[PDB]
Write a protein that binds this ligand. Structure first.
Ligand code: NAG
Lengths: 48, 48
């Protein structure tokens, strides 16, 4: 938003196996004034 | 002719020929971010 890349994050423990039914808001973690065009992204995996 | 000519600075030369270090500080203000602010004063905290 407005050249500001905002990253919010949360570390919720899993009560169960997958996708626990509950509510947990995401606290703000960082705001970066990178101001670049973002239209796609990719994740990185670690191979052992 | 060679475009580059040596200054040949010497202490015995006159003031107009002595070496002078010049720095141009251009405060570019691109119309989105703001990263260089001024370290302005902060006063004491008074309560009640
Ligand atoms: C890239 O972002 C700039 C502002 O930083 C905006 O003016 C421009 O339209 C954007 N370009 C695209 C292709 O979305």
């Amino acid at each position: 938003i407005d050249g500001y890349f905002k990253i919010y994050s949360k570390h919720t423990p899993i009560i169960g196996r997958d996708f626990p039914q509950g509510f947990s808001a995401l606290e703000p973690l960082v705001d970066l004034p990178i101001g670049i065009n973002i239209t796609r992204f990719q994740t990185l995996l670690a191979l052992n | 002719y060679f475009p580059l000519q040596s200054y040949g600075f010497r202490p015995t030369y006159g003031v107009g020929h002595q070496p002078y270090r010049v720095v141009v500080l251009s405060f570019e203000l691109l119309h989105a971010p703001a990263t260089v602010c001024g370290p302005k004063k902060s006063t004491n905290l008074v309560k009640n």
